Symmetry: D2
Subunit: 251 residues, 4 copies
């Protein structure tokens, strides 16, 4: 008798068993949700990985930069869940920024084509996914995406931080559209998960009043399932921080 | 089978059956929680209201301005839940600001005696409750307070808004103390709710009506000010195990109004 | 003697005499700044307009999507201002989102080619300008870009709101780079100003539904603002940008100054 | 010809010549301002200190907790500046939390009697001053208060952080009331400044641990700040206050300007 019993939920973003979306999927199933999964590029590898979930679930291909993939998605989901059935939840757990805009490469050296690809995949796609899927979502449903707090600049993350700032703004507009379908849209801002950079991750655990385990994706997956559930029915266009409370503390 | 099965939860601030705390209590019990209730001043009448709840729960007296009430609280809760047992949740649903600091009385005309009392009860008491009860709380536990978004000023609410701003800062420090016990501390920022207080000058009501109509239109999923259940349910989410990495934070149960400009 | 007496300040984004940049340039000049102006595309149209400023200034061509314009910008500015001289201020007053991303067009119907162009021009370009010009900036210098508060969603602004969220994040990163030169970086978040594009939307050009939305946004701004807001008057915004170009906010960087009548601090 | 030429400005909160208010007063006087000062308790020590300002100014007594001092303030200021004259600027640089609420003491051990005193002095008194002074303020006038960013919890500051949170909210209401007079109300959020009480804690007055926490805070501030942060130097903060009292930020009210080297805009 689980949190998400009899809910139909789409989960994107699994590439490995340490992917945040793997753990979102694992916990959702453990809570009685029936899943449809989406994957990008290495679909052979991803079938392998999704087999490790506790229950079978169909795996659809979705490259968020492919307009055909997006145009046909609602139909393909409906064939996999069965006509007359609709989704109750959608999980966006997709993000990418080329190495020129993330890492040791100076901020000013990122060419715009790279930044733009990163923003397409990491931010614009959240609207793309909601566009495709809202027509096949039931009232009371929920769309959740994955955020990393971009309110302050930080070393290394650079243009990925910019892209997450874009995502948060995207999420607010998607909530206006989702509202029309009685559907909620929110992001979970997670702490750093091991799916300058080490000094940033070590600072997290000390700021977090309850600590932060960067090797454990479960507290993040649980928070996403909270948002997929009926238990936060008045929250939309918002961000829930699953970060051990680190963003609430200066030192 | 319930969201809060076998959890022991203290719930303060029930005065009428339209109190937000009444509805947190009702939903908590529907979800298998075993409750201890606290009440201020009007305890006989408060029993006459809590009788209407789904299950029996002990009612203790607690005036958060009374130092003895606070010093004796851990003990009286421990007598009510049985020695060797500790609370898994605490709900602060306590707020007050005298007429001088809220309504049609000019902002500048509220005396500090009134403002200080308002802040004591509405903000400082969150720290008081956490002090008294953290020693009798289980790891994985959760303290939750009730907030009204004070990020932007608004007509009428005046010094009450100032007090909620204080509360949000208190919440972040209470989170530091609660962390030591593996306990979380969060606030739910509710949209406006028609309790007996809100259902009570002339231009004051008009600005409050404008505030509330504005809330529902801004809220992408709408806002029913007559329905406390969405707020209660959000408080139960936080009392549950499903938000275990969130502390010193604010969850908005406001229909998403605060995320929209128009 | 004036607020910016002796400062050399590059000001971009003049297209008409209702441009926010026109007013920034005017006020800067009234306060003793020596300007270099940059313009996009219609340079002869812009020359006619810049002739209406209190003083003359060199006008250079800068299309922020042109990588060669950017590569040559510092060399060309040095020519204009005299070799051995450097800039003390740079104003980015450049923004653009195609009508597919901003207006009556539904949020979900904006194709990514159009969004990406608008982000290149409205957000990324702030980093581009900083990259090109920081090498010719003096310590205690100031880069100011224009912003429109994207903290909460709103009708019509749509993907321009998203581009301003990006811009806020870019400014925080530009501040880190600018810090190495002793140069500060901030945005001025303005209230709605009746420039060319905003005049068009009100009055029907995109239909009565779009015209009504924006009129409700504007009227709501003035009433929320404790000192009121005059959408017809860019001077208070220009003065704010000049504040930030001066030496009077020397410890503010990576930040946003709101010149919006205080509207964003009030709910109703 | 200076920033505040001929403006009449009340400046509260001078105690020593390292006080933030002392530097605000000095800079305001350097920029041609005509001052009226207010002081608390040790009015003998304060007279001595204010005599070290560049120009003479009337010194009135003001204990913000005294209701008679507030009820008479307007009348006493008027007597000091001349009948038919009004104030253009008011500076609130008054803050206090007893050691039970700030320092090494556990957060939960602050009695409310001490917290309430700190909130009275540090937050409510921003409302009280504006109530007393707005009726003798000119349109285009400015009230400016002092803030320390309370958005995130931090060790030691405890209930003063809470007070600053209440101050920020108070400021947004004061803006509403001041707007009716054509007057702006803003707070300046400063980085840590080595004033009397701070220099003590770093010297070891409060012990090993308080000294080590404040030293960690200051170090981190300077590294987070892209332009750095010199805690010995109050001048950037004083300048920022003067910017706000001037006519150069005329569309900013109910707001917070950060004079913190940009530290609050960077995580690491
Ligand atoms: N790991 C962290 O520290 C952290 C922190 C905060 C937020 N997040 C976010 O969580 C989400 C998931 O990332 P993760 O840490 O689980 O890493 P991950 O590498 O497992 O997942 C990223 C996913 O994005 C997908 N993707 C990339 N390009 C795509 C395209 N063109 N079309 C469709 N999908 C595409 C990949 O297939 C991959 O499954 C991301 O949005 C990430 O930015 C991660
Ligand atoms: N109703 C709304 O619109 C709204 C919106 C957001 C947040 N809130 C907050 O939610 C909480 C609950 O308020 P409500 O709307 O349920 O109104 P309510 O009047 O039903 O409840 C307020 C409670 O505060 C208690 N209280 C007052 N003084 C006390 C003291 N000295 N000691 C202990 N308790 C004391 C009262 O007895 C009462 O039970 C408050 O903090 C309120 O500020 C209310
Ligand atoms: N008008 C408002 O209500 C308002 C409110 C807040 C902020 N802003 C911002 O102020 C800035 C100025 O806008 P405005 O209202 O003065 O309108 P405007 O049209 O006068 O300014 C836009 C300028 O951007 C320039 N531009 C467009 N593409 C360019 C390119 N590829 N390279 C270089 N320049 C290019 C245009 O030529 C024009 O000079 C923008 O950043 C805008 O987003 C405007
Ligand atoms: N690190 C810092 O020093 C720092 C950082 C940010 C903000 N601030 C703020 O700047 C302001 C000035 O503080 P400072 O560092 O110059 O300290 P300071 O001690 O130099 O000045 C504080 C002033 O508060 C006055 N005061 C206390 N109780 C009073 C009362 N009842 N009536 C009138 N005045 C009273 C004192 O007389 C004193 O002049 C305060 O609000 C402070 O919180 C300080
Ligand atoms: C927010 C975040 C942190 S790590 C992360 C992802 C999904 O692993 C990445 N997306 N893009 C990345 N780019 C490079 O590392 C090069 S890493 N996203
Ligand atoms: C935030 C809020 C809205 S209504 C409310 C309470 C708890 O009912 C009140 N607290 N204090 C109140 N004071 C007066 O109305 C007088 S009403 N609190
Ligand atoms: C924030 C803001 C408000 S007005 C503004 C700018 C710089 O003037 C604009 N940039 N891009 C703009 N784009 C549009 O208005 C979309 C649009 C057009 F670009 C052209 C015709 C109609 C139309 F609706 S307006 N930026
Ligand atoms: C924010 C801050 C830092 S030092 C300071 C004051 C005004 O000096 C103090 N107030 N109360 C103190 N104890 S120290 N306030």
């Amino acid at each position: 008798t689980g949190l998400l019993d009899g809910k139909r939920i789409l989960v994107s973003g699994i590439i490995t068993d340490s992917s945040i979306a793997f753990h979102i999927a694992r916990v959702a199933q453990e809570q009685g949700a029936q899943l449809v999964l989406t994957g990008f590029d290495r679909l052979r590898l991803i079938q392998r990985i999704t087999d490790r979930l506790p229950a079978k679930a169909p795996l659809l291909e979705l490259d968020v930069q492919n307009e055909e993939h997006l145009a046909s998605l609602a139909g393909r989901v409906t064939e996999a869940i069965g006509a007359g059935n609709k989704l109750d939840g959608v999980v966006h757990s997709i993000g990418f920024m080329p190495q020129t805009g993330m890492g040791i490469n100076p901020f000013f050296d990122a060419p715009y084509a790279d930044v733009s690809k990163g923003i397409h995949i990491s931010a614009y796609s959240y609207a793309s996914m909601a566009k495709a899927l809202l027509p096949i979502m039931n009232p009371g449903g929920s769309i959740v995406g994955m955020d990393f707090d971009p309110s302050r600049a930080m070393p290394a993350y650079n243009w990925m931080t910019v892209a997450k700032s874009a995502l948060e703004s995207v999420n607010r507009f998607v909530a206006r559209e989702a509202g029309k379908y009685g559907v909620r849209s929110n992001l979970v801002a997670a702490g750093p998960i091991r799916t300058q950079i080490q000094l940033l991750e070590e600072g997290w655990d000390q700021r977090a009043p309850i600590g932060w385990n960067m090797k454990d994706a479960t507290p993040v997956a649980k928070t996403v399932c909270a948002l997929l559930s009926d238990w936060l029915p008045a929250t939309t266009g918002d961000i829930i921080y699953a970060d051990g409370g680190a963003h609430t503390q200066l030192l």
